[PDB]
Amino acid sequence: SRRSENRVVVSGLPPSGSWQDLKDHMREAGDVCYADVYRDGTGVVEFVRKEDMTYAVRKLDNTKFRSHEGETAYIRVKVDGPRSPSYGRSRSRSRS
Amino acid sequence: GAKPTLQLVYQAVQALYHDPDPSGKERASFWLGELQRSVHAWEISDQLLQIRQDVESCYFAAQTMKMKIQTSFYELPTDSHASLRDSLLTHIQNLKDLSPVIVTQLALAIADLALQMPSWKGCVQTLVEKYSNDVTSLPFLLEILTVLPEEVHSRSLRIGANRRTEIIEDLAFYSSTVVSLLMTCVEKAGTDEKMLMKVFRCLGSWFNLGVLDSNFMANNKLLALLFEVLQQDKTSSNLHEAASDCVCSALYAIENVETNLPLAMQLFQGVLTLETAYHMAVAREDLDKVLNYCRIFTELCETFLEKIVCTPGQGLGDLRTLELLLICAGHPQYEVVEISFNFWYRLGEHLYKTNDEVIHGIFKAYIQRLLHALARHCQLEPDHEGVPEETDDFGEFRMRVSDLVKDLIFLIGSMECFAQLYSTLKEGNPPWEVTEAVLFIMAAIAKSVDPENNPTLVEVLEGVVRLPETVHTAVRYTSIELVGEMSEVVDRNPQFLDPVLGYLMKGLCEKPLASAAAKAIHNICSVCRDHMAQHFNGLLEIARSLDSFLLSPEAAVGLLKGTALVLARLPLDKITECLSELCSVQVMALKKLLSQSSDPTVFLDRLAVIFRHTNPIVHPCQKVIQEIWPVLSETLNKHRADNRIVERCCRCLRFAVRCVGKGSAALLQPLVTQMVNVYHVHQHSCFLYLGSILVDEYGMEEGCRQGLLDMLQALCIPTFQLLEQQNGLQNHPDTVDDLFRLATRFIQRSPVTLLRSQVVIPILQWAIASTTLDHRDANCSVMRFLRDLIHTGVANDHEEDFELRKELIGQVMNQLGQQLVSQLLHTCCFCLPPYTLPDVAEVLWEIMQVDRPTFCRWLENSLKGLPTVTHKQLTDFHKQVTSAEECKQVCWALRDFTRLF
């Protein structure tokens, strides 16, 4: 096992959604090195590679999630913490 | 062209697999690559398999067949499908005893074919009742049956969400037939590992798909057989790995313990029986075997995490689960315990989340057992020469330990733990490596320890400073980091300030200890700045000769940051005097570089951090800015071609300006001139950003408003040229980003100056084109500008000039309003990711505040012009947006609506 700072929080999960359902949905983006769901239909997913997280935020956000029981919901996928710089070389810029 | 000659493909193959040279092996690869990409690939691969010269070429052919099926399946006429299936089945039949590495590739190909051939329904059934009776067919039939469920999650196949669901339940239907088949295989006397491994890998694979019946598997010989070979010492390493992986798969397949309790019970009891075999494996030096046991254990606790948490100790929550981990944790090899780290995180996270600390007391002893286990794992080798390196493989482990301790410490009590670790540090004549490791775990938690029980806390600090220099380098280092983490105890007990400082100063004067010391010094300066006016003499003296201590750039900056934080607390009178000395050492170093390899970055970064954090309350700094500007302007001008240096140059100037503010007006025009002249030949987008800062700082003063507008209009000419190029927006997102941060500062400091200008017309135009730019930073900057622009025709009606601004925006809205709304709606539905929706909604929102009735028409027109979607859906979306009373509702409307596309 291993962990990363390439983390997204997922929301709007059905209460019957398992971390295995979550991992199965998010693996479309890349390798999941840590996953977990909580009580309130919320979860975290950590990716081995940053670019795979970015894909998840871009492509898996607002998608149809189907739990193992068959419960469907449209989920929210966003980066946990301050977002990553978009492509191109880094620049120091004030934000918020 | 035409298909390559076989002699040629045979030549390229032998190179790729036997030619030691890198340049040639690469060349063969591309040609074989083009062969694979080509249409001839099918035919060549098929020939190579019929000829079956050797293992190499059959492997290349099998792989190519597989690749063409999982990427290029579309370019096959429907009629060809049945024949390709017949080829692959004949091929895997003929080549089954050639090499296993060839059978897998062909097996993979057949699986990829079945998943993509709806005309091949019931393929599992087809395959089994066709090959199960031939005893020599079984190894590749199992292989196909093994890779088929693995390929359902193939990123290489990327089957649609709906088609994938059909697939899985179709497979679920036949899971019995393969289990039945799987049972028959082991259903013999004295079966060898080779057959057993195929059975377990196959079973595990169908478990992972989540289509096996828990209730049928609970009472089934395969499970008993799994734990059986996992108990037997005689079993080989390879049979072990297969058996273990299948157990972890069985566990993983249990998603809800309640629905799969029979299976759950079977697995729980099964794994507890393995502790003897673990000890036997550790009795030998069979590390491969123990790693397997720790994974099975860790997977078990993961599976029953809910029960360990909700109802600990009782039944499913039987805490022997955790004990098995603590056994693994005691193992001298740290690669064993790190297997379990993710479970511990997840366990701690769950206990914390469900805040019912009534139960928490039961876990404390387990965590403190784990912590002591991790404490010894952090011990460096007694023959370690230097400081503890964080970069190496073991230093990585310590950090994962350090992080895990921070997250679990609440279950023990940070104070309880901190004191207890320190106590043990005089008993037993401890070797340096036992002290360091205890100091290390102490540093991990020293921040979270409550300063209420001050006596035990403040005496630990007193213990660390009385350590002699004679102690091991690594002990001096970690104690420096512990002290650094204990700045709040130096803040509450100011008498310890001078001893701590004196101790850190000693470490600073030794080369391999400097950075750790400088960081600790920075912490002290940051937390204890309130009363450190006395020590400033020393900090300044360090600064006067900073590059002598062999510091890292970061530790250096942090040091200067520290001294600047306390300079700001000094009496206002001495600030202006000391600040100039603080900067002079930098200015002198830069001055040398102008007459000098010359890279001014570090002194630019050191100047920048000084300004950034020399922030007193009143100004003394603008006096110093005059001293700085001439050397910066020449530095800037010398490296005006280099973006990286200029960017650091502008960063420095950004913070110098932010420090002062409306003062230091002596720099505005000479900087603007230099910026505009340089930007003319080198379009560094940070001049736009620097420009936005000057506008942010001097935009209200109407004396500067003309000069600032001239700056913008001058900067925009090479800017628009840039964005005018092919892929101009995509290639210069930094320019778009910084251009509209600039435009935004104008539109909120002096809007009318910008709106009545001629340059606003191209700016607005580029904004509308920029709304479809798929670049998050640049797009935020654009949406923000549009929002702030349109809001100007609504904002602050209390001031006089409101009616003028009202008219200017109305014109803009008249001219462009309907095109913007169409663009915004376009980017949401087709171009950009869902995270842009809240930014779009805010622009749309401002348009309603300006003229909702016109907007209702505009939006209606936009929804009218759309290239699957019912008229009812367009209507109620229009209904949702226009009837929104909060901005939030437009976003929800877009969120929902976007899904339709």
PDB file of N, CA and C in Angstrom, chain B residues 125-200:
ATOM      1  N   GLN B 125     -19.778 -20.280 -21.707  1.00  0.00           N
ATOM      2  CA  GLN B 125     -20.397 -21.589 -21.920  1.00  0.00           C
ATOM      3  C   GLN B 125     -19.789 -22.294 -23.125  1.00  0.00           C
ATOM      4  N   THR B 126     -19.733 -21.571 -24.240  1.00  0.00           N
ATOM      5  CA  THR B 126     -19.107 -22.060 -25.457  1.00  0.00           C
ATOM      6  C   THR B 126     -17.726 -22.630 -25.185  1.00  0.00           C
ATOM      7  N   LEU B 127     -16.906 -21.840 -24.500  1.00  0.00           N
ATOM      8  CA  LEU B 127     -15.514 -22.193 -24.282  1.00  0.00           C
ATOM      9  C   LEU B 127     -15.332 -23.399 -23.386  1.00  0.00           C
ATOM     10  N   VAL B 128     -16.123 -23.492 -22.321  1.00  0.00           N
ATOM     11  CA  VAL B 128     -15.935 -24.576 -21.359  1.00  0.00           C
ATOM     12  C   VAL B 128     -16.360 -25.917 -21.965  1.00  0.00           C
ATOM     13  N   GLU B 129     -17.586 -26.005 -22.473  1.00  0.00           N
ATOM     14  CA  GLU B 129     -18.083 -27.273 -22.994  1.00  0.00           C
ATOM     15  C   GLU B 129     -17.419 -27.653 -24.318  1.00  0.00           C
ATOM     16  N   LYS B 130     -16.549 -26.780 -24.821  1.00  0.00           N
ATOM     17  CA  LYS B 130     -15.741 -27.103 -25.989  1.00  0.00           C
ATOM     18  C   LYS B 130     -14.354 -27.636 -25.617  1.00  0.00           C
ATOM     19  N   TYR B 131     -13.789 -27.201 -24.492  1.00  0.00           N
ATOM     20  CA  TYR B 131     -12.418 -27.612 -24.166  1.00  0.00           C
ATOM     21  C   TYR B 131     -12.232 -28.340 -22.825  1.00  0.00           C
ATOM     22  N   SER B 132     -13.254 -28.351 -21.971  1.00  0.00           N
ATOM     23  CA  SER B 132     -13.090 -28.864 -20.604  1.00  0.00           C
ATOM     24  C   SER B 132     -12.733 -30.352 -20.515  1.00  0.00           C
ATOM     25  N   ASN B 133     -13.143 -31.142 -21.503  1.00  0.00           N
ATOM     26  CA  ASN B 133     -12.890 -32.581 -21.459  1.00  0.00           C
ATOM     27  C   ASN B 133     -11.513 -32.948 -21.991  1.00  0.00           C
ATOM     28  N   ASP B 134     -10.997 -32.164 -22.930  1.00  0.00           N
ATOM     29  CA  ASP B 134      -9.615 -32.357 -23.337  1.00  0.00           C
ATOM     30  C   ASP B 134      -8.742 -31.870 -22.196  1.00  0.00           C
ATOM     31  N   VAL B 135      -7.962 -32.785 -21.637  1.00  0.00           N
ATOM     32  CA  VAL B 135      -7.140 -32.489 -20.478  1.00  0.00           C
ATOM     33  C   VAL B 135      -6.014 -31.516 -20.844  1.00  0.00           C
ATOM     34  N   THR B 136      -5.591 -31.528 -22.108  1.00  0.00           N
ATOM     35  CA  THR B 136      -4.507 -30.649 -22.547  1.00  0.00           C
ATOM     36  C   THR B 136      -5.011 -29.262 -22.919  1.00  0.00           C
ATOM     37  N   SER B 137      -6.321 -29.136 -23.105  1.00  0.00           N
ATOM     38  CA  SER B 137      -6.943 -27.832 -23.316  1.00  0.00           C
ATOM     39  C   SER B 137      -7.101 -27.008 -22.025  1.00  0.00           C
ATOM     40  N   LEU B 138      -7.264 -27.679 -20.883  1.00  0.00           N
ATOM     41  CA  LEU B 138      -7.580 -26.992 -19.626  1.00  0.00           C
ATOM     42  C   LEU B 138      -6.669 -25.826 -19.245  1.00  0.00           C
ATOM     43  N   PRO B 139      -5.336 -25.987 -19.368  1.00  0.00           N
ATOM     44  CA  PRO B 139      -4.510 -24.831 -19.002  1.00  0.00           C
ATOM     45  C   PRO B 139      -4.830 -23.541 -19.771  1.00  0.00           C
ATOM     46  N   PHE B 140      -5.194 -23.584 -21.059  1.00  0.00           N
ATOM     47  CA  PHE B 140      -5.431 -22.312 -21.753  1.00  0.00           C
ATOM     48  C   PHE B 140      -6.882 -21.889 -21.603  1.00  0.00           C
ATOM     49  N   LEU B 141      -7.793 -22.848 -21.472  1.00  0.00           N
ATOM     50  CA  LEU B 141      -9.173 -22.505 -21.126  1.00  0.00           C
ATOM     51  C   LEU B 141      -9.237 -21.755 -19.792  1.00  0.00           C
ATOM     52  N   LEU B 142      -8.516 -22.235 -18.776  1.00  0.00           N
ATOM     53  CA  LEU B 142      -8.466 -21.527 -17.496  1.00  0.00           C
ATOM     54  C   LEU B 142      -7.862 -20.139 -17.681  1.00  0.00           C
ATOM     55  N   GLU B 143      -6.795 -20.070 -18.475  1.00  0.00           N
ATOM     56  CA  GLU B 143      -6.124 -18.810 -18.783  1.00  0.00           C
ATOM     57  C   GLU B 143      -7.068 -17.807 -19.436  1.00  0.00           C
ATOM     58  N   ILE B 144      -7.872 -18.251 -20.400  1.00  0.00           N
ATOM     59  CA  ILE B 144      -8.883 -17.368 -20.993  1.00  0.00           C
ATOM     60  C   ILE B 144      -9.903 -16.950 -19.923  1.00  0.00           C
ATOM     61  N   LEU B 145     -10.331 -17.927 -19.129  1.00  0.00           N
ATOM     62  CA  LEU B 145     -11.323 -17.677 -18.094  1.00  0.00           C
ATOM     63  C   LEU B 145     -10.752 -16.752 -17.013  1.00  0.00           C
ATOM     64  N   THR B 146      -9.440 -16.787 -16.809  1.00  0.00           N
ATOM     65  CA  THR B 146      -8.793 -15.885 -15.860  1.00  0.00           C
ATOM     66  C   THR B 146      -8.695 -14.444 -16.368  1.00  0.00           C
ATOM     67  N   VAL B 147      -8.328 -14.251 -17.632  1.00  0.00           N
ATOM     68  CA  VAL B 147      -8.063 -12.890 -18.096  1.00  0.00           C
ATOM     69  C   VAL B 147      -9.338 -12.173 -18.535  1.00  0.00           C
ATOM     70  N   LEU B 148     -10.387 -12.932 -18.831  1.00  0.00           N
ATOM     71  CA  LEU B 148     -11.664 -12.341 -19.234  1.00  0.00           C
ATOM     72  C   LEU B 148     -12.295 -11.356 -18.214  1.00  0.00           C
ATOM     73  N   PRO B 149     -12.387 -11.722 -16.914  1.00  0.00           N
ATOM     74  CA  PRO B 149     -12.899 -10.737 -15.946  1.00  0.00           C
ATOM     75  C   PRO B 149     -11.935  -9.577 -15.686  1.00  0.00           C
ATOM     76  N   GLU B 150     -10.632  -9.821 -15.804  1.00  0.00           N
ATOM     77  CA  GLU B 150      -9.652  -8.747 -15.666  1.00  0.00           C
ATOM     78  C   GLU B 150      -9.810  -7.695 -16.761  1.00  0.00           C
ATOM     79  N   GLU B 151     -10.193  -8.132 -17.960  1.00  0.00           N
ATOM     80  CA  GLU B 151     -10.298  -7.229 -19.109  1.00  0.00           C
ATOM     81  C   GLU B 151     -11.578  -6.398 -19.085  1.00  0.00           C
ATOM     82  N   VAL B 152     -12.500  -6.719 -18.181  1.00  0.00           N
ATOM     83  CA  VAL B 152     -13.744  -5.954 -18.081  1.00  0.00           C
ATOM     84  C   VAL B 152     -13.444  -4.562 -17.519  1.00  0.00           C
ATOM     85  N   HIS B 153     -12.340  -4.447 -16.790  1.00  0.00           N
ATOM     86  CA  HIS B 153     -11.906  -3.157 -16.260  1.00  0.00           C
ATOM     87  C   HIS B 153     -10.695  -2.595 -17.006  1.00  0.00           C
ATOM     88  N   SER B 154     -10.499  -3.077 -18.227  1.00  0.00           N
ATOM     89  CA  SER B 154      -9.365  -2.669 -19.041  1.00  0.00           C
ATOM     90  C   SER B 154      -9.472  -1.204 -19.428  1.00  0.00           C
ATOM     91  N   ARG B 155      -8.425  -0.445 -19.117  1.00  0.00           N
ATOM     92  CA  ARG B 155      -8.318   0.943 -19.559  1.00  0.00           C
ATOM     93  C   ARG B 155      -7.975   0.974 -21.049  1.00  0.00           C
ATOM     94  N   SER B 156      -7.485  -0.160 -21.548  1.00  0.00           N
ATOM     95  CA  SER B 156      -7.126  -0.306 -22.953  1.00  0.00           C
ATOM     96  C   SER B 156      -8.353  -0.582 -23.821  1.00  0.00           C
ATOM     97  N   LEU B 157      -9.410  -1.109 -23.207  1.00  0.00           N
ATOM     98  CA  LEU B 157     -10.635  -1.416 -23.935  1.00  0.00           C
ATOM     99  C   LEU B 157     -11.653  -0.301 -23.731  1.00  0.00           C
ATOM    100  N   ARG B 158     -11.690   0.210 -22.501  1.00  0.00           N
ATOM    101  CA  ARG B 158     -12.551   1.322 -22.092  1.00  0.00           C
ATOM    102  C   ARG B 158     -13.984   1.204 -22.599  1.00  0.00           C
ATOM    103  N   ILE B 159     -14.573   0.042 -22.339  1.00  0.00           N
ATOM    104  CA  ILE B 159     -15.970  -0.242 -22.641  1.00  0.00           C
ATOM    105  C   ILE B 159     -16.899   0.779 -21.977  1.00  0.00           C
ATOM    106  N   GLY B 160     -17.942   1.186 -22.700  1.00  0.00           N
ATOM    107  CA  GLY B 160     -18.934   2.114 -22.180  1.00  0.00           C
ATOM    108  C   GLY B 160     -19.592   1.684 -20.880  1.00  0.00           C
ATOM    109  N   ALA B 161     -20.115   2.655 -20.136  1.00  0.00           N
ATOM    110  CA  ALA B 161     -20.636   2.401 -18.798  1.00  0.00           C
ATOM    111  C   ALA B 161     -21.835   1.461 -18.856  1.00  0.00           C
ATOM    112  N   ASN B 162     -22.676   1.641 -19.868  1.00  0.00           N
ATOM    113  CA  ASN B 162     -23.852   0.798 -20.021  1.00  0.00           C
ATOM    114  C   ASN B 162     -23.502  -0.586 -20.554  1.00  0.00           C
ATOM    115  N   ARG B 163     -22.631  -0.624 -21.559  1.00  0.00           N
ATOM    116  CA  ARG B 163     -22.203  -1.883 -22.158  1.00  0.00           C
ATOM    117  C   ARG B 163     -21.420  -2.730 -21.153  1.00  0.00           C
ATOM    118  N   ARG B 164     -20.643  -2.063 -20.306  1.00  0.00           N
ATOM    119  CA  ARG B 164     -19.894  -2.727 -19.245  1.00  0.00           C
ATOM    120  C   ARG B 164     -20.830  -3.423 -18.249  1.00  0.00           C
ATOM    121  N   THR B 165     -21.925  -2.752 -17.907  1.00  0.00           N
ATOM    122  CA  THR B 165     -22.900  -3.303 -16.971  1.00  0.00           C
ATOM    123  C   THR B 165     -23.578  -4.549 -17.526  1.00  0.00           C
ATOM    124  N   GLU B 166     -23.942  -4.511 -18.805  1.00  0.00           N
ATOM    125  CA  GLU B 166     -24.505  -5.681 -19.468  1.00  0.00           C
ATOM    126  C   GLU B 166     -23.528  -6.842 -19.399  1.00  0.00           C
ATOM    127  N   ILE B 167     -22.268  -6.552 -19.711  1.00  0.00           N
ATOM    128  CA  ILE B 167     -21.216  -7.557 -19.708  1.00  0.00           C
ATOM    129  C   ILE B 167     -21.151  -8.278 -18.375  1.00  0.00           C
ATOM    130  N   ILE B 168     -21.018  -7.494 -17.311  1.00  0.00           N
ATOM    131  CA  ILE B 168     -20.822  -8.033 -15.973  1.00  0.00           C
ATOM    132  C   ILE B 168     -21.945  -8.965 -15.497  1.00  0.00           C
ATOM    133  N   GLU B 169     -23.195  -8.596 -15.750  1.00  0.00           N
ATOM    134  CA  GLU B 169     -24.308  -9.433 -15.314  1.00  0.00           C
ATOM    135  C   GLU B 169     -24.427 -10.665 -16.198  1.00  0.00           C
ATOM    136  N   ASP B 170     -23.987 -10.542 -17.449  1.00  0.00           N
ATOM    137  CA  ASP B 170     -23.918 -11.684 -18.352  1.00  0.00           C
ATOM    138  C   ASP B 170     -22.902 -12.694 -17.837  1.00  0.00           C
ATOM    139  N   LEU B 171     -21.793 -12.180 -17.318  1.00  0.00           N
ATOM    140  CA  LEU B 171     -20.755 -13.020 -16.742  1.00  0.00           C
ATOM    141  C   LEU B 171     -21.232 -13.633 -15.437  1.00  0.00           C
ATOM    142  N   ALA B 172     -22.002 -12.849 -14.683  1.00  0.00           N
ATOM    143  CA  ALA B 172     -22.570 -13.297 -13.415  1.00  0.00           C
ATOM    144  C   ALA B 172     -23.423 -14.540 -13.622  1.00  0.00           C
ATOM    145  N   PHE B 173     -24.146 -14.565 -14.740  1.00  0.00           N
ATOM    146  CA  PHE B 173     -24.992 -15.701 -15.090  1.00  0.00           C
ATOM    147  C   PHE B 173     -24.223 -17.015 -15.199  1.00  0.00           C
ATOM    148  N   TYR B 174     -23.001 -16.960 -15.723  1.00  0.00           N
ATOM    149  CA  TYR B 174     -22.237 -18.183 -15.976  1.00  0.00           C
ATOM    150  C   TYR B 174     -21.186 -18.483 -14.923  1.00  0.00           C
ATOM    151  N   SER B 175     -21.136 -17.663 -13.881  1.00  0.00           N
ATOM    152  CA  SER B 175     -20.123 -17.822 -12.848  1.00  0.00           C
ATOM    153  C   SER B 175     -20.182 -19.213 -12.210  1.00  0.00           C
ATOM    154  N   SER B 176     -21.373 -19.805 -12.192  1.00  0.00           N
ATOM    155  CA  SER B 176     -21.563 -21.156 -11.669  1.00  0.00           C
ATOM    156  C   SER B 176     -20.824 -22.197 -12.496  1.00  0.00           C
ATOM    157  N   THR B 177     -20.929 -22.079 -13.820  1.00  0.00           N
ATOM    158  CA  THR B 177     -20.332 -23.061 -14.720  1.00  0.00           C
ATOM    159  C   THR B 177     -18.822 -23.089 -14.573  1.00  0.00           C
ATOM    160  N   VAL B 178     -18.218 -21.929 -14.344  1.00  0.00           N
ATOM    161  CA  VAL B 178     -16.773 -21.901 -14.195  1.00  0.00           C
ATOM    162  C   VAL B 178     -16.392 -22.377 -12.796  1.00  0.00           C
ATOM    163  N   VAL B 179     -17.188 -22.030 -11.780  1.00  0.00           N
ATOM    164  CA  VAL B 179     -16.940 -22.552 -10.429  1.00  0.00           C
ATOM    165  C   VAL B 179     -17.049 -24.073 -10.458  1.00  0.00           C
ATOM    166  N   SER B 180     -18.091 -24.573 -11.109  1.00  0.00           N
ATOM    167  CA  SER B 180     -18.233 -26.011 -11.302  1.00  0.00           C
ATOM    168  C   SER B 180     -17.004 -26.601 -11.985  1.00  0.00           C
ATOM    169  N   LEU B 181     -16.566 -25.961 -13.067  1.00  0.00           N
ATOM    170  CA  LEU B 181     -15.360 -26.381 -13.771  1.00  0.00           C
ATOM    171  C   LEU B 181     -14.148 -26.316 -12.864  1.00  0.00           C
ATOM    172  N   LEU B 182     -14.086 -25.234 -12.100  1.00  0.00           N
ATOM    173  CA  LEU B 182     -12.983 -24.972 -11.194  1.00  0.00           C
ATOM    174  C   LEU B 182     -12.928 -26.042 -10.096  1.00  0.00           C
ATOM    175  N   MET B 183     -14.100 -26.488  -9.643  1.00  0.00           N
ATOM    176  CA  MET B 183     -14.197 -27.559  -8.648  1.00  0.00           C
ATOM    177  C   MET B 183     -13.681 -28.894  -9.171  1.00  0.00           C
ATOM    178  N   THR B 184     -14.031 -29.221 -10.415  1.00  0.00           N
ATOM    179  CA  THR B 184     -13.588 -30.462 -11.045  1.00  0.00           C
ATOM    180  C   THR B 184     -12.066 -30.551 -11.161  1.00  0.00           C
ATOM    181  N   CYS B 185     -11.412 -29.413 -11.382  1.00  0.00           N
ATOM    182  CA  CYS B 185      -9.958 -29.402 -11.551  1.00  0.00           C
ATOM    183  C   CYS B 185      -9.234 -29.895 -10.305  1.00  0.00           C
ATOM    184  N   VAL B 186      -9.569 -29.304  -9.162  1.00  0.00           N
ATOM    185  CA  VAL B 186      -8.974 -29.700  -7.889  1.00  0.00           C
ATOM    186  C   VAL B 186      -9.531 -31.043  -7.437  1.00  0.00           C
ATOM    187  N   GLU B 187     -10.710 -31.392  -7.950  1.00  0.00           N
ATOM    188  CA  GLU B 187     -11.372 -32.660  -7.638  1.00  0.00           C
ATOM    189  C   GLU B 187     -10.573 -33.875  -8.117  1.00  0.00           C
ATOM    190  N   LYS B 188      -9.297 -33.939  -7.744  1.00  0.00           N
ATOM    191  CA  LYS B 188      -8.446 -35.091  -8.033  1.00  0.00           C
ATOM    192  C   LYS B 188      -7.530 -35.350  -6.838  1.00  0.00           C
ATOM    193  N   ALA B 189      -6.909 -36.527  -6.810  1.00  0.00           N
ATOM    194  CA  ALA B 189      -6.029 -36.907  -5.707  1.00  0.00           C
ATOM    195  C   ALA B 189      -4.576 -36.530  -5.993  1.00  0.00           C
ATOM    196  N   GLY B 190      -3.989 -35.734  -5.103  1.00  0.00           N
ATOM    197  CA  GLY B 190      -2.598 -35.332  -5.222  1.00  0.00           C
ATOM    198  C   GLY B 190      -2.320 -34.384  -6.375  1.00  0.00           C
ATOM    199  N   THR B 191      -3.130 -33.336  -6.490  1.00  0.00           N
ATOM    200  CA  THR B 191      -2.975 -32.375  -7.573  1.00  0.00           C
ATOM    201  C   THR B 191      -1.778 -31.468  -7.326  1.00  0.00           C
ATOM    202  N   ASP B 192      -1.053 -31.134  -8.390  1.00  0.00           N
ATOM    203  CA  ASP B 192       0.199 -30.404  -8.243  1.00  0.00           C
ATOM    204  C   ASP B 192      -0.066 -28.914  -8.133  1.00  0.00           C
ATOM    205  N   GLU B 193       0.969 -28.157  -7.790  1.00  0.00           N
ATOM    206  CA  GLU B 193       0.814 -26.722  -7.602  1.00  0.00           C
ATOM    207  C   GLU B 193       0.457 -26.004  -8.899  1.00  0.00           C
ATOM    208  N   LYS B 194       1.016 -26.467 -10.016  1.00  0.00           N
ATOM    209  CA  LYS B 194       0.818 -25.811 -11.308  1.00  0.00           C
ATOM    210  C   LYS B 194      -0.655 -25.728 -11.683  1.00  0.00           C
ATOM    211  N   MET B 195      -1.389 -26.804 -11.440  1.00  0.00           N
ATOM    212  CA  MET B 195      -2.823 -26.809 -11.696  1.00  0.00           C
ATOM    213  C   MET B 195      -3.543 -25.981 -10.623  1.00  0.00           C
ATOM    214  N   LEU B 196      -3.045 -26.065  -9.393  1.00  0.00           N
ATOM    215  CA  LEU B 196      -3.650 -25.369  -8.264  1.00  0.00           C
ATOM    216  C   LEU B 196      -3.564 -23.854  -8.436  1.00  0.00           C
ATOM    217  N   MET B 197      -2.409 -23.390  -8.905  1.00  0.00           N
ATOM    218  CA  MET B 197      -2.199 -21.977  -9.149  1.00  0.00           C
ATOM    219  C   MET B 197      -3.156 -21.454 -10.213  1.00  0.00           C
ATOM    220  N   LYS B 198      -3.399 -22.241 -11.260  1.00  0.00           N
ATOM    221  CA  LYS B 198      -4.351 -21.818 -12.284  1.00  0.00           C
ATOM    222  C   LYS B 198      -5.754 -21.717 -11.713  1.00  0.00           C
ATOM    223  N   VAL B 199      -6.109 -22.658 -10.849  1.00  0.00           N
ATOM    224  CA  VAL B 199      -7.434 -22.669 -10.239  1.00  0.00           C
ATOM    225  C   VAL B 199      -7.634 -21.455  -9.326  1.00  0.00           C
ATOM    226  N   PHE B 200      -6.620 -21.129  -8.531  1.00  0.00           N
ATOM    227  CA  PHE B 200      -6.724 -20.018  -7.590  1.00  0.00           C
ATOM    228  C   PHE B 200      -6.741 -18.660  -8.272  1.00  0.00           C
TER     229      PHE B 200
END
